């Protein structure tokens, strides 16, 4: 077996793998180049045959198509936010409250 390598897209590269996906969970995900993080969920969007993934007004990846069941999923980055501390003066007490 001899390998001919040229300045070509190299149509013979090898096999890929797969793993059972998860939904409604914060998880790092990969999709045939598209690789990000977020939460996967069933989508109500109705793509058309040759469209693979979707974008939004912010020009960011929003929806993807699973290349094993021809279904549409949505992605939402895992939750985040600032935190604040409510407290009376330390001259008075030491109890605090936390606001997310």
């Amino acid at each position: 077996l001899s390998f001919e390598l040229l300045h070509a897209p190299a149509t013979v590269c090898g096999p890929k793998k797969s793993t059972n996906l998860v939904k409604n969970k914060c998880v790092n995900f990969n999709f045939n180049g598209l690789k990000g993080t977020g939460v996967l969920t069933e989508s109500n969007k109705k793509f058309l045959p040759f469209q693979q993934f979707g974008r939004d007004i912010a020009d960011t990846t929003d929806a993807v198509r699973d290349p094993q069941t021809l279904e549409i999923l949505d992605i939402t980055p895992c939750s985040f936010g600032g935190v604040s501390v409510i407290t009376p003066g330390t001259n008075t007490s030491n109890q605090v409250a936390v606001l997310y």
Binding site: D56, I57, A58, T60, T76, P77, G82
Partner: peptide
């Protein structure tokens, strides 16, 4: 009306009008 507003206040509210999620899901909060 439940809002307990006046006939006018209602028109002012109605006259003045999902990019919010997109901006939010980038690092900016309101």
């Amino acid at each position: 009306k439940p809002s307990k507003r006046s006939p006018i206040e209602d028109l002012l509210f109605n006259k003045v009008t999902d990019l919010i999620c997109a901006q939010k899901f980038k690092g900016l909060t309101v």
